[PDB]
Design a protein around this nucleic acid. Structure first.
Ligand SMILES: [Mg+2]
Ligand SMILES: [Mg+2]
Lengths: 159, 168, 282
RNA sequence: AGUUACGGCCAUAUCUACUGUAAAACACCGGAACUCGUCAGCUCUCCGAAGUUAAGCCAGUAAGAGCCUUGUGAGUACUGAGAUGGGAGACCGCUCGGAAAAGCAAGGUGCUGUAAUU
RNA sequence: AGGACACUGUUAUAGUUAACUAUGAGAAAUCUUUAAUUCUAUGGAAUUAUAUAAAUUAAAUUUAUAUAAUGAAUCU
RNA sequence: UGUCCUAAGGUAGAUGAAUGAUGGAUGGUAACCAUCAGUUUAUUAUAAGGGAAUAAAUCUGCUUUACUUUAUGCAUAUGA
């Protein structure tokens, strides 16, 4: 626990139970382009291209693609401000960030509603995410629903 | 009976255990195995240093030769005549093999040749049914079925029929 | 001092295709790697495998859900050209990949620009034309078989280079090569055609008439003479350059085959069989 | 509707016992004149087609072990915010919110992509 | 934190034919497991048409760059 | 912890390690040879932690990438 490159890693760089071994082919078949969104997860079975332990699990953006490295931009919290960092990692340490898929589907579907309303004279009725407000009203039936009486009950010791 | 259920002889092994520091006792005994069958000898070394047996580590001790084919029948039929085709009951293993040993190789039928000397050896045989390539190949490796493995009493049957002999 | 149950719970089971002893996963990943800049360019690979009585050759390109074939060739297709006595020989590996690479280019219409050469046996690698498209690129999968000098797998990549498809290889694993000498091209030509098979057949007749009728019985039963084999083999290669097309089969329906199928026993028959087993004891 | 060649996910796909399969295929299987490899054509390599469905592959049975999943366990253990609440102390009680595992029952025992042959 | 004795370290006694079955005790440097909390990221740009290269591919085939147009989309 | 290594560096290929059971002339708790079992107990120069079972471990072969030159990042910062 002195100040080194790999300090205090006992449960962060341990491979989980019944999952040892070299990774598979579905990692290597993926591609990355400039402007995507990528999270970082260390696979502790290769020793060429590991980043520092601080960046384990933070999402960034991809700006360059090299023959052996990918470039990711991030944000670190140095004493006062929020700065800008760049790192080069290998392909076996990344993962495609989901979470824009429900957003990018909403872009493609709203773009279709705008197109069909050009042929008509109506105003646009876009798709936006729902809101939750006060509790709405409902209707209960007392034909098949019977109330159950609830009351207190005397205390009984466990033995 | 299906002819794939037969029993045969896979291989035979011979071992001469000499223990010494002299190469002349090795190279004399190395000519005897070549004189018996045309294969060449294969040496063996030590694992540790044991003063009680006169053994130092990484040093030659003994020789052994693995033989097969129909040549193994001629060596086996000679060796059974020394014990008058009589064997015990406990020579058979769990898996099926057995063995024996003779104190003198002159009883096998070679000449004296006194500078070579007199040695002794012990033999061991293997029995396998057809279909043993399954656990031995590289591609498509697998286990053997439970129906085809030889037991102790299967060696007690096949020994008496192929060699009319007495069990003790 | 562990139990029998803890020894099963701590077990890590290997992959399914490794469990059946069919592949080497470290050898596969090094073959299908790619630099990250070439996203749109997928690699090719040629697979050369043999069964106990056949030769299978495929050209594939890999994907995430699974592989896909581009063009295939089977050694049992050579009855259409007249070779049906030897389906596993040194010639049988050569003509199969030769039909494979000739069939792939006809899907891409490069047959006119890149045509076949004559089977001389000289060590050559095809090159590019000055203005048109460059040649196609294919790598080789050896599988699990060991690599020797005169192997049958290495002659199948010789058949792909003669069709015109560019394959990087060197002449060190051929027959008739020795170090620091020019390559003996005519000695390789005697193993491509089945000359060693014919001279073994001629030797057996005067030497052992009994053993010869056992070993070459289909060569006896068909009316095949040893002194004329390479006249038939050379005529077989000429039909592939004329027409490489397949022949279609009509599609029948096989649903009457369903009767050789055993379902699982249901829950009602499972609970019924238990009480009859308990009945016989009391 | 099943096989066979390449696979993706990597135990619902493993382990120990018994039992079964028409056609085609897959195997076992017969040998070292040549290339190649050993002490040993055992393995590897190279030519073959007399014999056999015994094993391997595939599919089944078990109040089977193992893995996967629902319910109970249980509003129980624990915990975010608070008061001039109680006790010599150790600590415990209350208000507004969040919420478990191990067991113990019931049920399951691979799914699938491209191509070829019956 | 809670949980467990299945891996590593530890502990009391009775049974059956070294192996199995019971009732008890445990872990700052043990884990088949696993909350409350703390923290990171998205919640507007995307599509079409045309052009440029000395990169890239078996290939207008991809990766990139321009110009034109089409827009306000969670609560306070 | 101020060390060790021309192989204990680089690469290609082959390979059930430690151990246990049953047997075999002299042969015994313990010498060598065959058969079956064997989920990592063995090894990986060294303190501890992490990783690796068609293996990064043991053998066989061949070699000197224990290189030369343009640019940039990470421990890490206001900073050598
Ligand atoms: Mg290094
Ligand atoms: Mg090393």
């Amino acid at each position: 626990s002195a100040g080194g490159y790999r300090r205090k890693t006992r449960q962060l760089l341990k491979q989980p139970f019944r999952k040892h071994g070299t990774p598979g082919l579905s990692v290597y078949l993926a591609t990355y382009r400039i402007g995507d969104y990528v999270t970082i997860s260390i696979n502790p079975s290769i020793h060429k291209g590991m980043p520092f332990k601080y960046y384990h699990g933070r999402t960034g953006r991809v700006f360059t693609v090299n023959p052996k490295s990918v470039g990711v931009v991030l944000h670190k919290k140095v004493n006062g401000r929020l700065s800008v960092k760049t790192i080069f990692v290998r392909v076996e340490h990344l993962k495609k960030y989901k979470g824009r898929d429900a957003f990018l589907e909403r872009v493609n579907k709203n773009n279709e509603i705008l197109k069909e309303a050009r042929e008509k004279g109506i105003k646009l009725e876009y798709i936006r995410q729902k809101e939750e407000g006060p509790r709405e009203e409902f209707i209960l039936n007392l034909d098949e629903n019977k109330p159950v009486k609830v009351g207190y009950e005397p205390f009984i010791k466990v033995y | 009976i299906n002819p794939m259920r037969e029993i045969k002889i896979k291989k035979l092994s011979i071992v001469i255990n000499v223990g010494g520091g002299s190469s002349t006792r090795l190279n004399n005994a190395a000519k005897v195995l070549k004189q018996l069958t045309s294969q060449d000898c294969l040496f063996s070394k030590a694992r540790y240093t044991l003063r009680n047996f006169g053994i130092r580590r990484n040093e030659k001790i003994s020789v052994h030769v693995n033989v097969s084919g129909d040549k193994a029948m001629e060596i086996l039929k000679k060796a059974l005549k020394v014990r008058e085709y009589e064997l015990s009951k406990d020579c058979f293993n769990q898996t099926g093999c057995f063995g024996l040993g003779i104190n003198e190789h002159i009883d096998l039928g070679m000449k004296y040749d006194p500078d070579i000397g007199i040695y002794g050896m012990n033999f061991y045989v293997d029995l396998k049914r057809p279909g043993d390539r399954v656990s031995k190949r590289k591609r498509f490796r697998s286990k053997i079925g439970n129906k085809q493995k030889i037991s102790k009493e299967d060696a007690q049957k096949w020994f008496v029929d192929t060699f009319e002999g007495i069990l003790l | 001092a562990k139990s029998a149950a803890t020894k099963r719970s701590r077990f890590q089971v290997k992959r399914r295709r490794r469990r059946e002893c069919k592949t080497n996963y470290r050898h596969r990943i090094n073959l299908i790697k790619q630099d990250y800049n070439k996203q749109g360019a997928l690699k090719f690979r040629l697979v050369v495998r043999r069964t106990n009585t056949k030769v299978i050759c495929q050209i594939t390109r890999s994907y995430i859900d699974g592989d896909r074939v581009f063009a295939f060739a089977d050694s049992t297709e050579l009855k259409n050209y007249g070779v049906d006595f030897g389906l596993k020989n040194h010639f049988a590996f050569y003509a199969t990949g030769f039909l494979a690479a000739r069939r792939a280019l006809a899907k891409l219409e490069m047959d006119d620009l890149y045509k076949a050469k004559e089977t001389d046996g000289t060590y050559t690698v095809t090159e590019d034309i000055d203005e048109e498209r460059r040649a196609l690129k294919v790598f080789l999968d050896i599988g699990l078989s060991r690599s020797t000098k005169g192997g049958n797998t290495f002659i199948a990549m010789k058949g792909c280079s003669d069709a015109g498809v560019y394959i990087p290889h060197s002449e060190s694993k051929f027959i008739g090569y020795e170090k620091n000498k020019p390559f003996k091209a005519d000695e390789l030509r005697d193993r491509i055609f089945c000359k060693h098979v014919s001279e073994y057949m001629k030797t057996l007749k005067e030497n052992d008439e009994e053993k010869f009728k056992i070993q070459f019985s289909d060569y006896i039963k068909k009316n095949i003479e040893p002194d004329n084999i390479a006249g038939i083999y050379q005529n077989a290669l000429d039909g592939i350059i004329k027409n490489p097309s397949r022949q279609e089969k009509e599609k029948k329906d096989y649903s009457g085959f369903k009767k050789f199928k055993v379902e699982k026993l249901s829950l009602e028959e499972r609970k019924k069989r238990i009480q009859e087993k308990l009945s016989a004891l009391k």
